[model samples]
Target: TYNVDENGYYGEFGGAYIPEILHKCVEDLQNNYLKILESPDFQKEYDQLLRDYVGRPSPLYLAKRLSEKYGCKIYLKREDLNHTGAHKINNTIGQILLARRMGKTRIIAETGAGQHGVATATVCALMNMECIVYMGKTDVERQHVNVQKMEMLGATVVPVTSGNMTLKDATNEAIRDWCCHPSDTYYIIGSTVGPHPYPDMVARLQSVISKEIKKQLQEKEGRDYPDYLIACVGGGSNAAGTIYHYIDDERVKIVLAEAGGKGIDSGMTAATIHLGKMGIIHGSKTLVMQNEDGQIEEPYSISAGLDYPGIGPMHANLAKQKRAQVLAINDDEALNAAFELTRLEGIIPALESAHALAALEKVKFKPEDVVVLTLSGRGDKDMETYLKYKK
Candidate 1:
């Protein structure tokens, strides 16, 4: 019920809408990706890296204290503990391996909050591949910790300054790079937001989150599924991974928190599903925040990662099909949620993940209802913003 079509599309939302110059790059990946992923040798290598390098099977901790306050049983899939302090490594690990196989020597990616940049750079360093990351100027300023981490890991961080100087603008630069170096460069997309094969491929790579959740839940709660699966959706990689395993299962309700920078009705918001119309952005047919003339609208948010104006195409389909509930969380609400969790659980969450925690008030569950919240990243990257918001 929640799967996409055979032609690399998700109900009219996904496709290879790339320029002619990048067609072969996408086609080569589409043809060889499945073969590589399913190969025994590849799985053996990928598994070892996950366990030893990226720290797979991140703890699924039953938050007795957090559950007490929420009036429901809650568990945190501790993705924040993953190497690089976020879920971005999952996709990076997979893509870097694939790039190696495809004989691509250079790695290029666009990052919003810098987690993906760090993760991509980590893999490149491990594999001895050249790495370059395009980041928004605004992101480079606020997410300085991660930018430093990326540079320390041997990746060049390029600051893009145009059109709000954010994720979307950075993405344009990455695509342009791909067009120029289609043979030697591999664009390691940070989220499930790009052209065909990428959304599906990234989702499959991130599927590890829910795969572990199902097994972990079976061990702890005697149930392999939860009553609710919740995560913040910013171009939707962490959420895609959290929801991938359970998408077709109607029993588990999916809830997404999209950034409501100020308010849903506020012009300055990244609540794409609510504010978007069907249009093209980042090479996919999906809902985008745009004007009547189809010019992309600038989106704003406290979290750098969630400030993009579009959701992943699959997420757009989920929103349209009503397969998932999308809630818009404003800046102050996410800030409050992050601070409260730090005080209560002693875990400071990233501002992007804070959006999901902010949805707890609106997403109701019974005391016995089991829920899994994907804590996608740590707050170390957001300490600057946290301090600013504290005042």
Candidate 2:
């Protein structure tokens, strides 16, 4: 199931297309990822980090209210409960350990929702490594609290001003900086959309969710698999991580929810899987919004984390293989789902998670069929977005 492509480009959607100067670094990562990840030392250290630092085995809550509302059994993989209040910590923990093993003394990362930056900063502080985080100027302003959190954790937060001042720009700036200082610094990409080892590595880090889900389901439902696995897809890390282990199992269906901004039909949208054409971004070729001339198109999403223009290559492979179903929900739908979850379950889910919540209406599952939704992050950071809607 995980064998999509040898080069890590899923169905021509994902491949490393970075500057030639970064080729060795990329190749080195690609060459070492599997071996490093499989080593007993790496596994021991990663498990320890997750247990002590990132808080592993986040709960798998049976959403009784949500299930009743949808007339189906709905389970939530509560990554929102993870440290830094998002699943981003999983990758950060693993990457920081890898950085130490690789002899890197500094860490750099990019963020849009600032979740990744916060996670990165938290790890760097614990490891006593110098950390720098690049965030879009707009996001830095909107997520000021997280920016301060980074500083409190002893990480410098740099605001990127180029190209719409969003996640894309921040990622571009981080890559440029990494290229300039590759030997001493390691770039910890937050999602699975980057080059070979990154997608694989991040997926491995985040896959702990599904692994726990398997055990949780066995205890709760006496079943090891769910009828459907659902999660929001920005760069597809969370979704990929949740579904990768079960990809080959036809019994477990996978669905990916993408931000639809206003609507997929609307020109202003971040519905990458729905409206995207194949293209490149952030050093990898994948499904991206593009113009007629193949120029990258700007993407819009109410959720900053889902504002990525390109999707991960593994997601592209899933689409090609028909192993996963993709759907979109507009900002209105996402906001309504967010509010609905708050009202029904007393849980305010992240806007990205709201995308998955909104998909329940699109999917038709029976009461007997169990559905597992990955609640990727908490909504605390979205107070501003919620306040805007409230007003």
Could you tell me which 10 consecutive residues in candidate 2 have the lowest summed lDDT?
A: 1-10
Q: Provide the lDDT at 25 for model 1.
A: 74
Worst window of 10 by summed lDDT in candidate 1 = 1-10
Evaluate all candidate structures by whole-model CA lDDT and list the values in order: 0.89, 0.86
Residue 150: error of model 1 in Å?
2.0
- In Å, residue 250's CA in model 1 sits off its true spot by 0.6
lDDT (tens digit, per residue) of candidate 2 on 229-341? 99999988889779877878988988899989988888889888777876667777778899777788878889888987888888877876788898888898899999999
